[PDB]
Design a protein around this ligand. Structure first.
Ligand SMILES: NC(=O)c1ccc[n+]([C@@H]2O[C@H](COP(=O)([O-])OP(=O)(O)OC[C@H]3O[C@@H](n4cnc5c(N)ncnc54)[C@H](O)[C@@H]3O)[C@@H](O)[C@H]2O)c1
Ligand SMILES: NC(=O)c1ccc[n+]([C@@H]2O[C@H](COP(=O)([O-])OP(=O)(O)OC[C@H]3O[C@@H](n4cnc5c(N)ncnc54)[C@H](O)[C@@H]3O)[C@@H](O)[C@H]2O)c1
Ligand SMILES: NC(=O)c1ccc[n+]([C@@H]2O[C@H](COP(=O)([O-])OP(=O)(O)OC[C@H]3O[C@@H](n4cnc5c(N)ncnc54)[C@H](O)[C@@H]3O)[C@@H](O)[C@H]2O)c1
Ligand SMILES: NC(=O)c1ccc[n+]([C@@H]2O[C@H](COP(=O)([O-])OP(=O)(O)OC[C@H]3O[C@@H](n4cnc5c(N)ncnc54)[C@H](O)[C@@H]3O)[C@@H](O)[C@H]2O)c1
Ligand SMILES: C[C@H](O)COCC(COC[C@@H](C)O)(COC[C@@H](C)O)COC[C@@H](C)O
Ligand SMILES: C[C@H](O)COCC(COC[C@@H](C)O)(COC[C@@H](C)O)COC[C@@H](C)O
Ligand SMILES: [Cl-]
Lengths: 259, 259, 258, 259
């Protein structure tokens, strides 16, 4: 319903938040090109959801693969309304001494250069149409320290800055650009069924500021749907946190004086 | 659909963004109490919309009326799911030499003290329910100068701070608190197009950062609907700008070098 | 000697961060008018500091007293270079259920309405001078929740918003406006009471993000001195946190996993 | 006298803001190691400033050169009190279509990867000392769009994020980390030729929000001196704008309605 006839690309679409968004976009009448490098999981998802959902292999660090992915999408569906640049790799809290120069450049390539290229070539086909929507997956670490690694933190800050520059430049052509910044969702790893899922959703239940709710990838997908739809038709330049208020509080003082 | 069985109170509900939100909440199956001091406009709206929409006179500077309004809502519908604290008066850009102490205190009473009272008494009846949602109308002046008066700007910053400390305290009870900060909204004129819409586009087309779109009171109602719905069930502490990216740019530098 | 010949007004100048700044301003050659309602403490500080330091009773909620105070400063010293709008009352973390409408309005009058009046009447005499500096005492609660009460928090946000519109309007006249947002400040007992200082470090050494250092009123005064001096001659619109990084971290996640 | 006996390293110290900070540090009793890749400019400055100021060639993209530069400073002076990570190249505002993937990676290496390496190896010799200070040169583009290129902007956001997580990690060891974010300064950006000095001063006076003052490299150096001194001994995690309020205003609306 809400994305009837819209064409959307989702990088990192074969798993996690990307997969949830591909599924949600599908349920709302969108044509979605899943862009990923886990070809077996990604093609399975596209085949599983039917004719509007195609899979395209794209390593977002390779500009030629990104260029083709976008050119293929316009060729297939006539244009791209929504670019959800979501591919990235994750680092938990670490030390500056744990930062290896090669692993920093590797993460910057996937997380930040990939966002640049995905945006550049989405803009390439959106600007002539004078319409379109670019959404980046950032992270709640963009608003509070203590929940992600140094290299990762710098890369997501860089995305926020890129998102704001594009919101201005592409505003002249009627195109919006925003970020969604989730607070830790269960994804990836070996799904150590009960062991990993119970341990995660028990930690997050003590860590979160908003009690009685656990953030799932499906929750993030719904916020992406909001940003991508005409219900957000005047929303641009925004880094929208989905974090239950985690980033607005430092509870140390209150914890210390009462315990 | 999206607010089926939910009970909402809307201050400043008889006109403008409040009236638009009341109408949209009604369309989504919510029970709505319009709270205002424009008894003619407010009662007329409630009668037109039917059984689920009522009108209650409430001056938000009067704590007895604010307490009575929330207690009557529980008595009538059994609880309050959504408090949309939206009542306020507006000031365009002005000079500090124009700030009159009595007008400052009057605006603070309506804009900022009224928000405290609505949140205090909503929280009182939401906390036992272990669920609920407080949404304030702030303003895009909370993130850029140059679009609102001195007294008004300080009152809306105060609301943002209240919202963030409410998101922390009330998060322990499963309750969310957020702000919507709209930019240039056309109100007061009879919509469905008009002479009044097109020419307002004439102003905003030179002012806005996002070209080819004007913000309407109905667009803002839609963003409040998102924040108030279960689609935002892990969004809290957020001041959500609806400004087309106006607040993320100062184009003076680009303007001067391209003159 | 960084404020040689400069004229400063300090609201809430009779104690705490205000008094520390009054003393530091005096040490740097400033002429200071202490503005407060603690007449005895305030007159004593002014008498003790000498010819360049005066004292004026001024309830910042009373606009006539605020206008009179600034006009007296111009009449006495020829103008006002620095307005340190610092008067206010504090609230530690509390519940919205504790917010009393009369105490909310009382605090708003002092913390936020007083900030408007001080700034209005400073701007009035600074604009003809084409120079000057308005500095507000805000608070680190403007950038993190959990360290101040509801009413207090809203009043300090209001100050930040007021500061930013002032930086714009007064920027055209060469006038700067900034906030200082300190964290856990000792204030209370200025005289060398070691018992109270070490005990305060017992709390702050567990609460603060920057370890091995405690913030004092004299440290806040030094940061105000920077903002008020020509070393900050192009700093404007800034809410300057003095918090050791407290407001940039929520350590709950790391605490739970470790 | 304000940095008497302190040991400071300044990357990009041979020109511009870096050189200005080196001389001001020299004037305040500091021992300074100038770190740059412009060997003739840097060695000239170290010779003229005397015994306390030396020069070390260091390309900030090579971790071994950064490693050696910090070890050489410790070998000579016994430790490092101040790391002024200032090296970078600048981009004026541009279009996303102008972003070349190779140039993006080149700028990321200098601006952001270089900051990472400088901070890592400063932290290496500061953490045992239980004292120290890391200062990054970011940019006013970190708080509004419209004054820098896309690649440059994303790199300076990344620096801010890195600064925030260091202030937390290094806070437990008594070490502070901050950014200084200047607006437009006449340096090695536009040539020493006086035909470009009368023009740069004229643009900045029209563009700035604070009138009657032009930002110079010496003004920034003084703000770095504040951040690096014991006068800011409880300031950490701060991105300190030196911009005259440029980033807090979008004057478009006021410009059009009074045009
Ligand atoms: N999972 C969390 O807890 C969490 C928290 C905050 C932010 N995020 C962000 O959300 C985004 C999505 O991650 P996720 O949580 O859904 O886990 P995920 O790993 O299952 O999904 C991310 C996908 O990115 C793809 N990827 C890696 N390199 C790629 C490349 N070069 N080209 C194309 N795809 C590539 C992976 O194949 C993967 O399917 C990421 O950008 C991540 O940084 C996640
Ligand atoms: N119009 C804009 O462009 C704009 C821009 C930014 C923010 N806002 C905010 O939007 C909010 C909604 O106003 P609107 O723009 O839709 O038009 P509006 O002013 O007509 O509606 C606001 C209502 O607040 C009510 N009000 C004033 N005092 C009250 C009191 N004591 N008790 C109860 N109600 C009281 C008014 O009666 C009014 O109907 C306001 O808080 C306003 O500040 C509007
Ligand atoms: N104490 C802390 O830890 C802390 C933390 C964050 C912010 N602050 C801010 O520092 C500011 C100064 O207070 P302080 O902490 O130094 O304690 P303080 O008691 O020593 O100073 C407060 C001053 O405000 C004055 N005051 C109250 N009402 C006044 C009025 N009507 N007119 C004139 N002066 C009036 C008081 O007399 C007093 O001199 C306050 O705005 C406070 O919020 C303090
Ligand atoms: N001048 C301005 O208007 C302005 C505005 C905002 C930010 N900045 C920042 O100020 C910082 C300092 O640069 P500047 O403006 O003084 O101009 P600058 O070119 O005169 O000084 C920067 C120095 O970095 C050096 N550099 C380049 N690559 C290097 C490398 N790989 N290793 C070591 N040094 C290298 C340059 O040689 C130069 O001496 C930069 O990071 C810049 O981004 C400047
Ligand atoms: C294994 C992994 O958890 C190590 O990271 C913890 C660490 C704790 O610092 C945060 C505290 C607020 O000072 C640094 O590791 C310390 C050694 C002793 O294990 C994380 O520090 C980075 C901040 C930014 O999150
Ligand atoms: C620096 C520049 O952008 C500020 O202009 C001053 C200003 C212009 O308004 C005039 C117009 C009739 O409303 C607005 O002040 C800036 C505030 C918005 O922060 C001064 O206003 C004088 C009249 C409105 O009483
Ligand atoms: Cl935050």
């Amino acid at each position: 319903r809400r994305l009837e006839g819209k064409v959307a690309i989702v990088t990192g679409g074969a798993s996690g938040i990307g997969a949830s968004t591909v599924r949600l976009f599908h349920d709302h009448g969108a044509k979605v090109v899943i862009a990923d490098i886990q070809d077996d999981l990604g093609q399975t998802l596209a085949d599983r959801l039917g004719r509007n959902i195609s899979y395209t292999h794209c390593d977002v660090t390779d500009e030629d693969q990104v260029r083709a992915l976008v050119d293929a999408a316009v060729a297939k569906h006539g244009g791209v309304d929504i670019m959800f640049s979501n591919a990235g790799i994750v680092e938990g809290p670490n030390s500056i001494f744990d930062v290896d120069k090669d692993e920093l450049e590797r993460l910057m390539g996937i997380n930040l250069v990939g966002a640049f290229l995905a945006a550049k070539h989405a803009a390439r086909v959106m600007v002539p149409a004078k319409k379109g929507c670019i959404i980046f997956t950032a992270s709640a670490c963009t608003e509070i320290a203590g929940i992600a690694g140094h290299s990762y933190t710098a890369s997501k800050y860089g995305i926020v800055g890129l998102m704001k520059s594009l919101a201005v430049e592409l505003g002249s052509h009627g195109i919006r650009a925003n970020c969604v910044s989730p607070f830790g969702v269960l994804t990836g790893i070996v799904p150590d069924d009960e062991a990993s899922k119970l341990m995660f959703e028990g930690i997050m239940s003590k860590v979160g500021n908003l009690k009685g709710k656990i953030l799932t990838a499906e929750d993030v997908a719904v916020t992406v749907l909001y940003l991508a739809s005409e219900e957000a038709s005047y929303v641009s330049g925004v880094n929208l946190l989905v974090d239950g208020g985690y980033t607005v509080v430092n509870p140390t003082f209150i914890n210390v004086i009462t315990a």
